[PDB]
Design a protein around this ligand. Sequence first.
Ligand SMILES: CCCCCCCC/C=C/CCCCCCCC(=O)O[C@@H](COC(=O)CCCCCCCCCCCCCCC)COP(=O)([O-])OCC[N+](C)(C)C
Ligand SMILES: CCCCCCCC/C=C/CCCCCCCC(=O)O[C@@H](COC(=O)CCCCCCCCCCCCCCC)COP(=O)([O-])OCC[N+](C)(C)C
Ligand SMILES: CCCCCCCC/C=C/CCCCCCCC(=O)O[C@@H](COC(=O)CCCCCCCCCCCCCCC)COP(=O)([O-])OCC[N+](C)(C)C
Ligand SMILES: CCCCCCCC/C=C/CCCCCCCC(=O)O[C@@H](COC(=O)CCCCCCCCCCCCCCC)COP(=O)([O-])OCC[N+](C)(C)C
Ligand SMILES: CCCCCCCC/C=C\CCCCCCCC(=O)O[C@@H](COC(=O)CCCCCCCCCCCCCCC)COP(=O)([O-])OCC[N+](C)(C)C
Ligand SMILES: CCCCCCCC/C=C\CCCCCCCC(=O)O[C@@H](COC(=O)CCCCCCCCCCCCCCC)COP(=O)([O-])OCC[N+](C)(C)C
Ligand SMILES: CCCCCCCC/C=C\CCCCCCCC(=O)O[C@@H](COC(=O)CCCCCCCCCCCCCCC)COP(=O)([O-])OCC[N+](C)(C)C
Ligand SMILES: CCCCCCCC/C=C\CCCCCCCC(=O)O[C@@H](COC(=O)CCCCCCCCCCCCCCC)COP(=O)([O-])OCC[N+](C)(C)C
Ligand code: NA
Ligand code: NA
Lengths: 225, 225, 225, 225
Amino acid sequence: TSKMQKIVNHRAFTFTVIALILFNALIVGIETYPRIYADHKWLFYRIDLVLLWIFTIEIAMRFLASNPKSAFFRSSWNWFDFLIVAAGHIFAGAQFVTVLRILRVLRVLRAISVVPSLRRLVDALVMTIPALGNILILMSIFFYIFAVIGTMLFQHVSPEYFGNLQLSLLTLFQVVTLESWASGVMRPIFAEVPWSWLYFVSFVLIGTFIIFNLFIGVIVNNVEK
Amino acid sequence: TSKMQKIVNHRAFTFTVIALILFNALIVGIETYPRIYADHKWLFYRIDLVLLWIFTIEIAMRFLASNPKSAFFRSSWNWFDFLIVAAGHIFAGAQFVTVLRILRVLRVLRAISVVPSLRRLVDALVMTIPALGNILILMSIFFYIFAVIGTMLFQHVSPEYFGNLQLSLLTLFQVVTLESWASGVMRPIFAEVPWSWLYFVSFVLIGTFIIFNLFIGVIVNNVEK
Amino acid sequence: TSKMQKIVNHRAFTFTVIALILFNALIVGIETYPRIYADHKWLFYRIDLVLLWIFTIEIAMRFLASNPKSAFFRSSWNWFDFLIVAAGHIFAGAQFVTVLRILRVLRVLRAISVVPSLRRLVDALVMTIPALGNILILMSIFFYIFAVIGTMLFQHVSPEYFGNLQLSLLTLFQVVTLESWASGVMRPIFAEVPWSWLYFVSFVLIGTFIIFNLFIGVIVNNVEK
Amino acid sequence: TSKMQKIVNHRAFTFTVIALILFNALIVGIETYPRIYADHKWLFYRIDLVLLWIFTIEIAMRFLASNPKSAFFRSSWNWFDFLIVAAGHIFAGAQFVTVLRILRVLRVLRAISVVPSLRRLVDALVMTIPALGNILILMSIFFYIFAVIGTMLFQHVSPEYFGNLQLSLLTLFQVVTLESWASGVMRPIFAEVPWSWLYFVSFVLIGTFIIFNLFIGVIVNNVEK
Ligand SMILES: CCCCCCCC/C=C/CCCCCCCC(=O)O[C@@H](COC(=O)CCCCCCCCCCCCCCC)COP(=O)([O-])OCC[N+](C)(C)C
Ligand SMILES: CCCCCCCC/C=C/CCCCCCCC(=O)O[C@@H](COC(=O)CCCCCCCCCCCCCCC)COP(=O)([O-])OCC[N+](C)(C)C
Ligand SMILES: CCCCCCCC/C=C/CCCCCCCC(=O)O[C@@H](COC(=O)CCCCCCCCCCCCCCC)COP(=O)([O-])OCC[N+](C)(C)C
Ligand SMILES: CCCCCCCC/C=C/CCCCCCCC(=O)O[C@@H](COC(=O)CCCCCCCCCCCCCCC)COP(=O)([O-])OCC[N+](C)(C)C
Ligand SMILES: CCCCCCCC/C=C\CCCCCCCC(=O)O[C@@H](COC(=O)CCCCCCCCCCCCCCC)COP(=O)([O-])OCC[N+](C)(C)C
Ligand SMILES: CCCCCCCC/C=C\CCCCCCCC(=O)O[C@@H](COC(=O)CCCCCCCCCCCCCCC)COP(=O)([O-])OCC[N+](C)(C)C
Ligand SMILES: CCCCCCCC/C=C\CCCCCCCC(=O)O[C@@H](COC(=O)CCCCCCCCCCCCCCC)COP(=O)([O-])OCC[N+](C)(C)C
Ligand SMILES: CCCCCCCC/C=C\CCCCCCCC(=O)O[C@@H](COC(=O)CCCCCCCCCCCCCCC)COP(=O)([O-])OCC[N+](C)(C)C
Ligand code: NA
Ligand code: NA
């Protein structure tokens, strides 16, 4: 025999939850001001516990009235909600307290799934990645090749930018965004090894011919259907 | 009984007004040269008063011959004109005189509405925002989440960029435009907290995957109809 | 009675001219090396005179066999060629010799019109400006408004960037390209007048919402037909 | 009489080769850590020789069972593979050893052709260049003209940026990407020769009106068919 499955889908419930979130998006933006932080310390503690408990019972009521161990877990969205709330209860203890606050901010991130207009949008934004699934592998192979070539070439001439396979993977990401790729990344080096203009000029051409052909691929694909 | 509603829509009136504006766009660009400013001081005063009065009577003649208290106020454009001119008469006094000059420059902005070719264009440019009304909320939620996370993480390590919820909202806007996001914003910080490359690299990827999907959304939408 | 109009349109003539240009594109790129410049001085003088004369007779033969004072001047392209060559003969004298060399380089620019594949392309690229003829006026009005507002606001706080109506028109062009608009242009100023983040943030949003709507306008228009 | 042409196209062969490559993409990324490099020196030597030999016999088996001296060489892809492997055997000697390592990294680049999903993609990405074959010539002519004009104009005022026809060809490439084109490239110069704002402002407008019309050309072309 069923039960109160007719109120969790009521319109006087979504608005309650969004009001709660928006209040939590404010109580967590406010507590970044040390002045008002210490002045109302041990109040944020309580109100955080309250909001956490309300959210916990909230997902609970959204679980019982949704085909128990059947469909509630068949969706990714429900898993996202339950994951955050459970993560709230998990880390609550004498630990690296800082990782507890980021979870509160992510609670405000949950406002994406309780606004049916946004949930559908982010679904559309996520189900376009499988389309550009090959260009991304081709972009990763070239990122890797250049990250190895740059490391074994500019290791003892600029250890800040090309020091290891990771620092030189970061330098290669600053350059695809064309951020100081020449004034800072490539001018000092091109003074030591003069044939190095070939590395950066060939990378900026290839790495930008692939990016613009990913962008065009999405334009064509989305317009197609 | 009607009156001279047949001259405000005459073509020998729009050209008069545009001539007046273009003259005011010149008399206000010229007065930014202190040399010629002081040398012809107390002349700009008079000519400003003249232009203001002509503009005032101008909107008046555009009001009486346009269904009195009926349609003249039903449009946004007419409200824009009347608002500027009234703002001219409002602030004229012994006050922060500098806020009076900006109103003159905005008088030249009014040239958008008296050129029927431009008015229609800006109407089309404004009535495309409701289309991208969801992507903007999704972009604002992520701006806010990252502005709070960055503030409560990089507060005592770079107070210039992430000092409060607002300074760190400005830093996060410089980074979406990819302006010195790594050379200046993220290199000094990544030296203090080494795991911070995750903050900026994840933000530049997410915040740019949303922007390019807003741009594509507009391309698809406008091409659609 | 007609004459040799059947050789200027011969295919053994375009190739001669392109060979000449490509040789002039080399003789003018080579003379920028002072070493080989002085070492073969007074040779470049002669060969320049030769090439100039050949080009002059070349347009002459392209003039006589093309409906004398009828259609030869009805086209813009022919005017472009004749203008450059005449400009070559005009400035040749005891003058600011430097303005003579730029004319040689522009002779190599003439290679656009003698390659029928390029001439058609640049025609298509030029006859799309009348399409975006309104967005450009709307972009110019906003450039001007902000150039005046910035000048009468940031004149005595950063005379390098906003000194007059022109220096502040240049600063406003560096910012639409998002080049150091915050690290260099807006950070020093935002320290003097704190409410100035409104100027640059509002300009970067408006000036980029118009540019992307010009780009989209061209995409839609060109795809349309 | 034919032979074992039925195993090189077996699906238990492509996976073997990709496993080998992915292992070589790891053995070459790992050897950029000097710590683990010297500690396991003279082991990388052996394993490199092994992988090289396996790859050599691998292309050999892909050659014999593919119409001997007929079609194996009619394709560009097969030439690419054989070229890399032969280049591996070629340079192996008492020479500039550094050019030997880059060949290993390029062996991992070969993973593009043995993944039928990628090979087709890169074919599509390469057969779109003939489409934009005219815009590229028009872009090269303007790059060259400006590279000569800038060199013969800003030679003795900024020898770092415009020193010769090549250094000024590099400066002109940093500017089309809008990287520090004003803060670094054009501000110091505009202080010496004041009319030089014309060079950079006219170049950034022309060189960006051509790039955006190349991008649009590809959008239109790819959407067309
Ligand atoms: C279908 C084809 C797919 C093509 C993809 C190719 C993928 C091929 C994958 C290749 C794998 C790369 C080789 C891994 C080498 C790590 C081993 C190592 O040396 O660790 C070092 C530590 O240093 C570290 O801290 C580890 C850092 C991890 C490197 C991350 C690079 C991942 C590249 C991903 C590229 C993705 C693309 C990038 C853009 C997204 C240890 O050495 P040590 O410093 O001397 O310290 C002493 C040892 N100790 C620590 C035990 C005491
Ligand atoms: C559908 C879901 C929507 C999601 C949207 C989520 C929106 C949720 C909204 C969240 C609201 C954010 C919390 C506001 C906290 C202000 C209170 C405060 O502490 O003031 C401080 C002053 O400091 C100031 O000067 C006030 C500055 C206003 C902050 C502007 C951030 C707005 C974020 C908008 C984000 C938009 C996105 C950004 C990109 C566009 C006072 O503290 P004090 O300094 O110690 O001074 C002593 C007090 N005294 C001054 C009285 C003497
Ligand atoms: C349909 C609606 C259209 C809307 C468009 C609005 C256009 C409205 C047009 C407005 C015109 C702007 C006012 C001109 C003022 C110049 C007078 C002056 O003071 O000269 C000064 C010299 O300084 C100079 O060297 C002159 C520099 C010319 C300014 C170029 C700005 C053009 C703006 C174009 C904007 C285009 C957009 C920008 C983006 C493309 C003289 O003063 P002085 O220094 O003290 O020297 C002593 C005098 N002496 C030199 C004689 C001895
Ligand atoms: C259809 C129409 C097509 C239009 C295209 C137009 C193409 C027209 C082509 C024009 C060719 C350009 C002229 C070449 C001049 C080199 C001669 C020289 O002086 O060498 C100097 C060395 O300096 C060097 O090291 C050589 C560097 C090569 C210059 C590369 C520019 C290529 C431009 C490509 C532009 C492509 C576009 C750019 C963007 C991709 C020698 O002089 P020196 O220093 O005093 O040393 C003493 C001599 N010594 C060394 C023997 C001892
Ligand atoms: C990868 C693509 C290449 C393109 C080829 C183009 C032509 C190839 C041009 C030149 C090739 C040969 C150069 C001769 C000298 C080489 C060695 C050298 O010494 O370097 C010298 C110059 O070298 C440069 O500065 C490179 C010039 C930049 C070319 C950028 C082209 C942008 C393409 C635009 C794309 C748009 C169009 C799209 C069309 C694709 C510098 O060293 P140095 O002078 O000896 O000084 C001493 C060392 N010191 C610095 C420490 C003091
Ligand atoms: C968010 C997405 C991640 C992507 C994962 C990719 C693989 C993940 C790779 C590495 C992951 C693990 C790194 C091992 C070390 C971590 C901790 C650390 O010490 O940092 C170290 C290095 O760390 C880096 O520099 C990060 C490398 C930049 C990766 C950028 C990938 C760009 C994606 C391209 C997108 C295009 C393709 C699109 C495909 C999506 C730095 O610290 P340190 O060495 O100890 O030095 C001491 C501290 N000190 C600096 C103060 C002196
Ligand atoms: C134009 C659009 C506005 C947007 C409104 C957004 C919310 C409005 C937020 C705040 C509004 C009110 C701010 C309170 C303080 C104002 C006065 C002040 O003192 O400034 C202070 C902070 O001020 C800032 O730093 C501005 C924050 C940048 C907002 C950028 C939003 C990016 C939009 C993203 C677009 C993507 C989404 C698209 C959606 C459109 C700085 O001064 P101070 O702290 O007193 O320090 C002393 C002075 N000193 C610096 C010299 C030492
Ligand atoms: C190529 C296109 C041009 C556009 C024309 C626009 C109007 C033309 C405007 C002015 C033209 C005439 C200027 C008068 C002075 C010239 C000589 C001079 O002295 O320079 C002076 C100022 O000069 C500038 O700063 C130039 C202003 C930048 C205009 C950028 C327009 C951006 C177009 C936006 C595109 C978007 C819209 C698209 C529409 C296309 C500087 O020298 P000085 O003051 O004597 O100082 C002493 C020297 N010192 C510096 C070493 C100390
Ligand atoms: Na940029
Ligand atoms: Na930059």
